[PDB]
Amino acid sequence: SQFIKPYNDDPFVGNLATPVSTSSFTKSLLSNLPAYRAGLSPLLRGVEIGLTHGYFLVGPFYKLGPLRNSDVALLSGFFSALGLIVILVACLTIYGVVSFEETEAKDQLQTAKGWRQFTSGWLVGSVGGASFAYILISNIPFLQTAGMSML
Amino acid sequence: MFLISWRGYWQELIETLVWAHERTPLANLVRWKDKPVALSIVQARLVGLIHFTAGYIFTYAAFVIASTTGKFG
Amino acid sequence: ETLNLQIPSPTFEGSTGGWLRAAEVEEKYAITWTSPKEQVFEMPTGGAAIMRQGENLLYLARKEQCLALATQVKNSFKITDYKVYRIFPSGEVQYLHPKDGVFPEKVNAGRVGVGNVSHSIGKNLNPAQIKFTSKSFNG
Amino acid sequence: MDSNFLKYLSTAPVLFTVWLSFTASFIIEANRFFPDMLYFPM
Amino acid sequence: VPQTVAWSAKTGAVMVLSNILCIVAGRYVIQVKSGSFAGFGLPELLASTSLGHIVGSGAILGLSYVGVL
Amino acid sequence: SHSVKVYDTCIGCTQCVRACPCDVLEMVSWDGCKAGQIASAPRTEDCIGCKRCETACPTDFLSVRVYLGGETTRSMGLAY
Amino acid sequence: KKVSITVDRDPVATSFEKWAQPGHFSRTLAKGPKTTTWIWNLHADVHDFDSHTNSLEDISRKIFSAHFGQLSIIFLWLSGMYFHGARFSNYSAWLSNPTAVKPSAQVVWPIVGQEVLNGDVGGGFQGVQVTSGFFQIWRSSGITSEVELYWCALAGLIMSGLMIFAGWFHYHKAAPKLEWFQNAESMLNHHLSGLLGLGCLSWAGHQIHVSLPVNKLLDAGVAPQEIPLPHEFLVNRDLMAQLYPSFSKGLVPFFTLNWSEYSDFLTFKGGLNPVTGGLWLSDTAHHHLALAVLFIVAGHMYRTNWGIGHSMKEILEAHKGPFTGEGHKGLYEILTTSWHAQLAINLAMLGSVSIIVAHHMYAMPPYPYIATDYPTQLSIFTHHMWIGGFCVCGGAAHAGIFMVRDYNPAQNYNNLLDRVIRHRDAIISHLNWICIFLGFHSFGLYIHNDTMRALGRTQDMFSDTAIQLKPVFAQWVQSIHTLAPGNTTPNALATASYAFGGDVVAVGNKVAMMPISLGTADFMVHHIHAFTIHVTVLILLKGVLFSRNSRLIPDKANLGFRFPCDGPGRGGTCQSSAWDSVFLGLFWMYNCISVVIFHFSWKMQSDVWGTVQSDGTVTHITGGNFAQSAITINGWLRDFLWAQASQVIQSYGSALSAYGLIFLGAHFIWAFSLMFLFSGRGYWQELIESIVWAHNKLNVAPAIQPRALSITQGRAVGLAHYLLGGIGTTWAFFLARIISVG
Amino acid sequence: LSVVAQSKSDFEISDGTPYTLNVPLVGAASFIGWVVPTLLPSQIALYGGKGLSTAFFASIGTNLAKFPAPPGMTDPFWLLCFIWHSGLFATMILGSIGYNGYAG
Lengths: 151, 73, 139, 42, 69, 80, 742, 104
Ligand code: CLA
Ligand code: CLA
Ligand code: CLA
Ligand code: CLA
Ligand code: CLA
Ligand code: CLA
Ligand SMILES: CC1=CCCC(C)(C)[C@H]1/C=C/C(C)=C/C=C/C(C)=C/C=C/C=C(C)/C=C/C=C(C)/C=C/C1=C(C)CCCC1(C)C
Ligand SMILES: CC1=C(C/C=C(\C)CCC[C@H](C)CCC[C@H](C)CCCC(C)C)C(=O)c2ccccc2C1=O
Ligand SMILES: CC1=C(C/C=C(\C)CCC[C@H](C)CCC[C@H](C)CCCC(C)C)C(=O)c2ccccc2C1=O
Ligand code: SF4
Hints:
This is part of a larger assembly, with 8 protein chains of 8 kinds.
Chain A: E1 5-6, E2 16-17, H1 19-22, H2 24-32, H3 42-64, H4 73-99, H5 112-139, H6 141-144
Chain B: H1 7-23, H2 41-71
Chain H: H1 23-38, H2 52-65, H3 76-102
Helix pairs in contact in H: 1-3, 2-3
The complex binds chlorophyll A (6 copies), the ligand CC1=CCCC(C)(C)[C@H]1/C=C/C(C)=C/C=C/C(C)=C/C=C/C=C(C)/C=C/C=C(C)/C=C/C1=C(C)CCCC1(C)C, phylloquinone (2 copies) and iron/sulfur cluster.
One chlorophyll A is lined by residues 64, 67-68, 71, 181, 183, 186-187, 190-191, 194-195 of chain G.
PDB class: photosynthesis
Keywords: alloxanthin, growth phase
Entry title: The structure of PSI-11CAC at the stationary growth phase
């Protein structure tokens, strides 16, 4: 048995079919991620990705930022995470302007209208996920420490 | 680094980075407008010269000012 | 004359050295050749492949890759039956080499000389003479 | 003595090493018997 | 220190057993060469008895270590 | 593209044409030299600028001259 | 009996004719010089045998005799080390007072005032202090007199004469055929059993009959000339049974398998001898006996002439799974037909072994009184780290020469090489990403700390007194090794090394070894080590994997292993050969090994070496500043380079003034190298044209037309002078510093 | 348990090749095969008179009693578990090789 084969039956394309690349488990994960999942509008793809990324962004800023030992650390962690999100949304916006020409179609990410929808969703989701992480950390003492409240 | 190592090594690295970006999921959604290439031969000479010269100026300026300040004499 | 797209490719297990997205959106090169044997050769982009007895066909990203393979087949397996094509994503196939049926190192009638300058290289014009002028430095 | 061995001793690296060793050697001997000559004594 | 014993017939018994064990194993597992009367030669016998003195020495020392002796 | 020129000192040795890795050069008929042929550069859009032709040339100063110019995908040697 | 001796008799005539014809060995060089490039090309390609000859037989014969020539040089070198110890040394005085006398075996002539180099090393002697650790070797051997050192010198000279004779004989009189050299099973059987196994067994016999009694008497305190000569231990079995009573029983316990009788002299003590600060020589004797046993056992694995044994080809071809195609098929043919493939493997392994030697010899000091001779410990650690790094980079050089020259795709279809070459982009892009990740998160921690300490924010630093990056896995491994005696190594009495934890071993009030604690600075510099090793692997591996072809140059194998470029086109292909990745990877090897030896020197001075005052407190050489100062670059610059260069720069007028001069001279050579590295050949050829014009004007132009060095030779000269200057600057700095303070 | 020793879901270790991972059989057999020899007792302070498997199981129990607190650096938990896991991984690897490849 051989686990490595040419990519999509083509021996001369610059890729290989390896278990990491093209196993059934890998195919299931890639196909079900919001970027690639079927039946999702570009805006909804942006929302789901945004919620995930904004939620984890708050934590490193809060625990390791300059104001970490202060009593305003969570507020600083939220503002710095929000500041990063605002910069990232601008990165998405400028990419959309140069990369895609204007066309009628709006149902795909790699279209000017579609990329704009993805940016709108990602902005709202990142603000929403960062806000959710803020509420949870503000109220639950386990999250404020590293779980160190139990010891 | 710009003065000792020359173009061919770096162009071959950059070709392995172009391959890896195109094959990585969630990352190949983003595409360059300009094909990444290694710096040119003359450009690399200029960049190494600028880095060398700037380091020369900044190191001596820090020394001549701080040693004279710290000594006052 | 035209590329028969159905020619079987030489057996190959794949590599990362093959062509990338620029081949499917800008241009691709193809090479065909006849082999009297089912023998192993080296791919320009990687490891080893096996050319099948009869007609073989490859796809590469660069013209230099097709010609580096052509040089190899001629030098080792004495295969002078190689034809190199350019293929555009529109489907247009452009025959490339040998351009008029005869190798470039052999003279052929009906070839018109391009780039030939009537004087020797030391007789060119100084840059100052042709400054702010469209006149070419080759005399 | 063998003419090919003498043709080997006439090669540039052998003559260079021997001549500069002889040269270095009489500088060393001259500074052994007549040391610290900062000036031509006059 | 692991406890070893002066040579007795028990030590000999272990050695003899291991040597015979390896002679039969060598008749079975030596891939390049009347169960013992086909193709049995001096290099085969000398190899199976060399492994017998290695297996036997290890077995004697281990059984001395644990108390079986 | 790069600009490749052949000057009339070419002795028609065909060495530049054989050394070119991208089939830029070919031999055409010419009465100027003894060999009856001169090098030609009909396909400079494919010239990568390697200057293997100039290395191959045996005339005292090169009959074939490569002048590196504007860069394209072909002349940059980019397989991507 | 297909393993047989076959020899051509009188192959090559012993003639001086080709001596007189420089360049005789190649068709290009044999027609004589026309430009100065010929001279350089003569030296560059001379030992490249497979570039002169087509036949593997003549190549193999040349290699075998050149290995005899190298052995003749090594034996002459050893004989000279023994003769200088016998004739020009204070060895006899050092034997009486190993802790007071400083070893010295080199005396200078008085010529231009250079006799200041004959410093007062002790024992009524003046000379250059030597740091190679030969005195401790000789005491471990049980030499005890200059007379025995003269006999060792004569034995070295006789071996040197026999090796140069054997090289001449086996090239010119009786040269083996190719089928003799292509006996890999026989060669491995003899080199495991015969060379390594009987080497260990014979040395174990010497340790037991000479080193153990003589060193037991020395460590008891007996004067060296009061000690019986080494053969009186061999004969008078009663005198040997006095020191080691197990000898009263002779060899009956060995043969009857009653081995626990021999526990007097075959111990498993561990730790260090308290008197000498070295390993127990009873342990080294047991170690060499056990290694001898299993090297002789291992040299019986492979099949030679009687059917028992393994075929290495069958072992290799049988190991293949579902990820790796045909598996190790074709590797036997590679390694029995290519000398470069064998040299690539053997150089990488020999370099790795030298790096292991460097770590193991400082941590488990094997010789008596070498642990408290700090100049020797620093010298042999630094020396074997440099030998290791060079040999590893030559392993990748000869992997590239194999791939360019000896690699044939027809015989390597779908095996392990074919598959590595067919996913080399995935390998090089993942290594490239690791090197970026690991430079950011190792050196970037240092830059974060420079910035925080400079900004007044010491609570924001990665340090022990701040945000901590502790090496918990290394600390845990140290814990296990201190718990091992009596627990997981129950019959051991002490730990393998006190570096893991435990006591302070002091000899002559100087620390032999003591626990080397790991903190945030140790976490940081270990990730610096992993970063520099990963980058060196990236450069050398990228050179090997892309040696034949790239996306850039599709026919790189036709240009060879060593070519300067393929022109200014494709944007520029400067330094595209496999040789140019060895050239670039020797810089990163230099960077890696320089940081390793700096880490060792500062950590040992700061936290291990020093003096044990009353109450058991230890005063280290630099007073424990590593922990709080090796976390910033400014700390390394100020507290290590600046503070410790005081001895080299203040050495003028003393016996260490030679180190001050070599410090400056190596700074010079290093800077001079940058003339060759930052420059290009075309400038220098055009400058040489005007110089040639001035010679033509005076009618004195040479007939060997001067040329600027080749592009490759400009790179090779720049790299040679760079390494010579940088290593020389560190050599002088390390030696003057540790001779003054340690 | 991506696929068990049965033709359930159409699993493919790679692009087009189905391959039955025998996660039940290999995991169970590797677990038991490693554990029974590992029971071998030893009067060593790390084991404490039990075997490696029994001591590892006991270490989980003693540290689980102090549930929030982690085991200390000198605690025998870290040595016992690392050796047990290393052996289990090795016998799982060898078991997967033997069963999937030799099929008998
Ligand atoms: C192999 C390593 C080695 C090294 C590095 C040294 C190094 C040294 N030795 Mg030691 N020595 C060695 C081995 C070694 N020795 C051995 C094996 C012996 C035993 C015979 C000795 C015995 C010995 C004695 C007895 C003495 C030294 C001395 C010296 C010192 C000065 C040597 C000198 O300037 O004479 C230079 C002498 C010359 C005649 C100059 C020769 C220069 C020529 C031109 C070199 C040319 C080589 C040639 C061109 C090669 C090609 C051959 C040709 C056919 C082309 C120096 C520290 C001296 C010392 O320490 O005094 C305190 C001293 O008296 N050595
Ligand atoms: C027991 C057998 C034996 C031993 C000891 C060696 C030893 C050696 N071989 Mg090997 N060799 C052997 C069998 C053996 N070979 C066989 C059977 C073959 C054919 C397949 C080869 C083919 C072979 C090749 C092709 C090469 C070697 C090389 C070497 C040298 C490796 C470098 C080194 O470590 O030397 C330094 C270590 C030493 C110990 C130096 C010792 C010098 C002598 C020769 C060792 C033996 C002396 C003697 C037996 C001891 C007498 C003891 C007495 C006082 C009681 C080393 C001398 C390489 C070499 O350098 O060639 C010269 C090399 O290229 N050998
Ligand atoms: C790893 C070691 C290392 C390295 C690589 C560097 C690298 C550098 N240092 Mg730093 N430095 C270091 C360690 C190091 N330093 C340490 C440990 C200290 C002590 C804390 C310093 C202190 C230091 C100071 C104080 C200065 C540097 C300077 C420099 C720069 C020299 C630039 C150049 O091209 O030289 C060019 C070299 C020269 C122009 C002269 C070389 C110095 C000689 C010894 C003095 C001059 C001699 C005389 C005038 C000329 C003789 C003429 C000839 C005919 C004989 C460069 C950035 C200098 C700088 O920025 O240069 C502008 C500078 O001012 N460094
Ligand atoms: C350019 C090469 C070079 C040079 C000049 C030196 C110079 C020195 N070495 Mg080093 N060494 C080197 C390469 C080199 N080494 C390499 C590549 C290795 C790795 C094998 C070592 C391993 C090594 C050890 C282990 C020791 C030295 C020691 C010494 C010193 C005393 C020399 C002596 O008499 O040896 C005497 C050597 C011994 C008495 C013991 C050597 C024992 C080893 C295990 C022998 C192995 C030989 C075997 C054939 C090699 C097999 C390699 C393997 C991969 C198959 C001196 C500073 C000694 C030292 O530090 O003394 C203070 C010392 O103990 N060297
Ligand atoms: C066992 C070790 C070993 C062996 C047998 C070889 C053998 C070979 N190598 Mg490899 N190599 C090795 C180790 C080894 N190398 C190591 C450790 C490295 C890393 C640096 C390399 C890197 C390397 C490269 C990059 C290349 C080779 C090449 C070669 C071949 C040509 C050798 C030649 O003609 O040089 C002739 C020898 C010289 C010109 C000597 C000069 C070298 C330096 C600059 C002089 C030494 C300075 C000195 C030690 C200090 C001076 C003191 C100063 C203060 C004055 C030959 C097959 C070349 C090749 O083409 O192979 C096909 C090649 O391109 N090797
Ligand atoms: C650690 C436990 C272990 C070990 C040592 C072996 C060893 C072996 N098995 Mg077994 N197997 C195991 C677990 C193990 N298996 C389990 C758990 C299962 C059930 C799922 C199977 C099911 C199985 C089948 C169905 C078959 C085998 C077969 C084999 C043999 C050759 C194929 C192979 O796996 O190559 C392994 C090769 C070796 C072990 C020898 C190479 C020597 C090196 C040093 C390997 C060392 C690896 C590792 C470090 C050892 C770890 C030991 C321990 C600390 C965990 C070999 C004797 C086949 C065979 O020959 O049939 C009898 C066969 O048909 N095995
Ligand atoms: C675990 C694990 C094990 C095995 C290996 C492994 C897979 C790699 C690893 C996984 C690791 C990883 C990478 C795990 C990563 C896990 C991550 C990043 C999870 C993110 C979760 C985001 C949430 C819950 C956002 C919620 C936002 C909400 C509810 C909206 C709120 C708001 C809206 C808009 C509505 C109004 C109110 C507000 C509050 C304003
Ligand atoms: C490192 C290196 C590279 C790789 C370097 C690259 C690709 C430079 C890319 C720059 C990165 C993308 C950002 C750095 C830009 C500057 C830090 C800031 C730019 C913005 C201001 C200048 C306005 C080469 O391409 C090269 C080519 C020829 C000889 C030597 C070398 C060489 O040494
Ligand atoms: C200086 C220099 C030269 C010219 C260097 C020359 C001509 C070397 C000079 C050597 C003279 C002729 C002899 C002097 C040699 C030394 C006294 C000692 C040499 C020791 C070994 C050669 C044996 C180049 O050719 C070059 C080429 C490519 C990049 C950089 C450079 C470069 O920097
Ligand atoms: S090489 Fe120079 S001379 Fe020979 S053909 Fe090409 S151009 Fe004419």
